[PDB]
Amino acid sequence: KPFSXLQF
Amino acid sequence: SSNDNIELVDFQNIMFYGDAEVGDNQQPFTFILDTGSANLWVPSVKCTTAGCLTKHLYDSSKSRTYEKDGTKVEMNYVSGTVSGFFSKDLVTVGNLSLPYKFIEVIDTNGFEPTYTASTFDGILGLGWKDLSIGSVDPIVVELKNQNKIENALFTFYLPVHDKHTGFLTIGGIEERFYEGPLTYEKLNHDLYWQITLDAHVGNIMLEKANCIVDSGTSAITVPTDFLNKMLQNLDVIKVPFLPFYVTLCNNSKLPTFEFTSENGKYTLEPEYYLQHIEDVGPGLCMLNIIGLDFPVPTFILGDPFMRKYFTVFDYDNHSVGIALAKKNL
């Protein structure tokens, strides 16, 4: 998974 | 100086951190300061999963100010999920404190192997209220209403590995961080720090692209379709199954991202998204770019971007400011 702590 | 400054350090180049404390006794934690999320959680001493065995745990029984909430909450990120329950206590970022509603994480299993691998305890969201869970106002916003900071804005001047440290600055724009004009861009929603720009990488163009300035992403995100085209004759291999792109660091065909608005033109040259990996091969580099599709074309202007560009996240003006960052303080 691409390291991103964006939330949905 | 008249603003709150948190120091940023960058070790391996996967994700940099900041410190802050929770609890009247200053329990210390290492945080990912994430503009892409809107909640603040720490691993609890109630945490039963293995990821917590090596993390800094919050113990509400040791802080006078603790205040029980208990309602269950779950957090879903692009990279994982964590769960626990809300709690209330004094959160301290830099030299300011305030009562805040946070999440005590007791289950990390849905955030592996990343969590155990990485070396941070929790996350501290710096986004907008709507985005949050449990209707929680952004820290910076609360600090402002409480007359604790000049403006309801915060800036990022990211650290560069083995060069200079960085700063999260709350309540004020310090010119020490950049040079040239600061060009503001309006948000199209008070959910994400998302603005509209035209994306022109090489010969590929996405007019009115959806752009998210995001400190919580280590790479530059691009719509898979766009990534594929973008790299179609630049002598860049994609690992057979592995989601990476290896190429020669010297490859003269490496493109330069160009996003434009009425008010500014921001470029991201190769030197900003290339990751030397001599180990794998003398002269080799991996591109810090990755595919990620949203229902509407969208790019995530990650760390590689914020590492060249000083950024201002201004709630009062519902906009994001961009300025070329001083290469050194």
Side-chain angles (χ1 to χ4, degrees), chain B residues 5 157 167 169 174-178 310 324-326 329:
Chain B
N5 294 278
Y157 172 75
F167 288 102
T169 308
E174 282 163 30
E175 302 190 315
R176 49 188 281 223
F177 294 126
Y178 57 108
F310 175 64
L324 197 53
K326 284 266 181 50
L329 291 185

Side-chain angles (χ1 to χ4, degrees), chain B residues 178-183 322-324:
Chain B
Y178 57 108
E179 47 190 53
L182 186 60
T183 310
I322 304 185
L324 197 53

